[PDB]
Design a protein around this ligand. Structure first.
Ligand code: S3Q
Length: 466
């Protein structure tokens, strides 16, 4: 019909092929369910309207179906739209040295070329503003973007080229607060600066949780939604695609295993009761700070194979501390029903529990197909990417919640450099912790032997009241 004749031919432009059941599926603006990468780029830079939601979702999730170099090539190809040939009358006009009417050419420029070219520049602007890490990880991608942006000519393009350049430079420079004062830093046995004596029972339980909450808050806030899409932290190139997420996972593994190591490596029953009691006090302070990540690291350590089975140790734990620890576990029951009600009812600041997002993203990634097939053609399942993007959107709503707590660099460095496993692998280390648990509290028919004390200093806790 007339509509497709106005548009460029498929032999000169790939983004003008009409929609059909084998290139795009839908669920004022229609929501895209699936499509070829060409149809996704086309609707990303559609001429009829802007789509901020689809631009946001696409730039968070595109790396799961398209490489950054390929996306740049596609939006440049999209921008280079062929203009129609002059009509027969205008060909005669031009050949006579006269100005053509160019009515359709001007219409196509105003109603199609200009909107698409401005929509391509808007993708470029959102790309550098919210995903500049793609350009830091690939210097050549930035050379190509700056060459493209630097050669764009036009009246309406001028403002866009300058705002994209302002964002690029502002991001390059970024490479190189409190309304009230924070509480007084707490000390217990270990003195400020005597890092050689820093340990679970020597540092104040309040300050251990405060400094871990700052460290975990910082770790939580550095994770970018794209580190979670396509399960890329589980794939082979995980170290480049998911550096902040892997730091968050390694911290949680190291802290949880450190709590287990402190517990099972304390062979004396009375001393081990004090260690467990101190970790529950650390959890109580994580509850006061709304650090749900920390609360569930402690629950994870208490529910581990080596610790959960220590019946003689939990027998001596006061009922008040037992009920605190049992309620913290109930945050995880019924698919984290209680955790989610708590998270939505608290006031900021908080550190949400990170593991539940990883779990739900893996369930979405494993339970939805990468493509949808229609008439023998493969279409990228975009609604799969949108569901993962919605979950990572839940992460973001809590990434602007700084804590009014003073950093203590020595305690911060102690928790950053925790290495409970040492040179052992995780599986072999957890086998060791469980074999140590059987040593300190043997199975029922075998009796309970006594063990010598290892702590010279006192075991009494200073408490959780500041
Ligand atoms: C069905 O499996 C479980 C049910 C649980 N139910 C509750 C109420 N809490 C649990 N765990 C908490 C963190 C806990 C851990 C150690 C010791 C105590 C204390 F002795 F203090 F009570 C409490 C549970 C753990 C489970 O499996 C590992």
């Amino acid at each position: 019909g007339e509509e497709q004749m106005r548009l460029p031919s498929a032999d000169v432009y790939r983004f003008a092929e009409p929609d059909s059941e084998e290139n795009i599926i839908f669920e004022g603006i229609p929501i895209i369910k699936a499509g070829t990468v060409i149809k996704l780029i086309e609707r990303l830079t559609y001429h009829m309207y802007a789509d901020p939601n689809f631009v946001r979702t696409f730039l968070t999730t595109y790396r799961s179906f398209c490489k950054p170099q390929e996306l740049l090539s596609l939006i440049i190809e999209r921008f280079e739209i062929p203009e129609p040939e002059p009509t027969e009358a205008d060909r005669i006009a031009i050949e006579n040295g006269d100005q053509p009417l160019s009515a359709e050419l001007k219409r196509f420029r105003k109603e199609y070329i200009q909107p698409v070219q401005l929509r391509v520049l808007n993708v470029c602007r959102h790309w550098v503003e919210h995903h500049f890490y793609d350009f830091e990880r690939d210097a050549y991608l930035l050379q190509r973007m700056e060459e493209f942006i630097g050669t764009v000519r036009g009246k309406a393009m001028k403002k866009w080229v300058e705002s994209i350049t302002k964002i690029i430079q502002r991001k390059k420079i970024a490479r190189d607060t409190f309304q009230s004062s924070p509480p007084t830093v707490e000390w217990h046995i270990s003195r400020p600066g005597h890092i050689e004596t820093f340990d679970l029972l020597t540092l104040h339980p309040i300050e251990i949780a405060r400094q871990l909450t700052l460290l975990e808050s910082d770790l939580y806030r550095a994770v970018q939604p794209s580190e979670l899409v396509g399960s890329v932290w589980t794939k082979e190139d995980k170290e480049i695609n998911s550096p902040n997420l892997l730091k968050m996972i390694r911290h949680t593994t190291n802290l949880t295993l450190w709590f287990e190591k402190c517990i099972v490596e304390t062979e004396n029953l009375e001393e081990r009761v004090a260690v467990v009691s101190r970790i529950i006090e650390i959890l109580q302070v994580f509850q006061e700070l709304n650090n749900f990540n920390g609360v569930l690291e402690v629950v994870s350590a208490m529910n581990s194979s080596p610790v959960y089975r220590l019946d003689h140790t939990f027998e001596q734990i006061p009922s008040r501390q037992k009920k605190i620890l049992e309620e913290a576990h109930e945050l995880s029951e019924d698919h984290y029903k209680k955790y989610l009600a708590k998270l939505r009812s608290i006031n900021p600041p908080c550190v949400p529990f990170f593991g539940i997002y990883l779990t739900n993203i893996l369930k979405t990634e494993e339970g939805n197909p990468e493509v949808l097939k229609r008439h023998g053609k493969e279409l990228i399942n975009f609604s799969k990417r949108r569901k993962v993007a919605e979950i990572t959107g839940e992460i973001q709503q809590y990434q602007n919640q700084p804590y009014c707590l003073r950093v203590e660099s020595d305690i911060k460095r102690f928790f950053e450099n925790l290495n409970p496993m040492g040179n052992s692998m995780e599986k072999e280390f957890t086998d060791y912790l469980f074999n140590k648990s059987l040593e300190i509290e043997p199975r029922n028919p075998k009796p309970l032997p006594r063990f010598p004390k290892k702590y010279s200093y006192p075991l009494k806790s200073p408490g959780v009241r500041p």
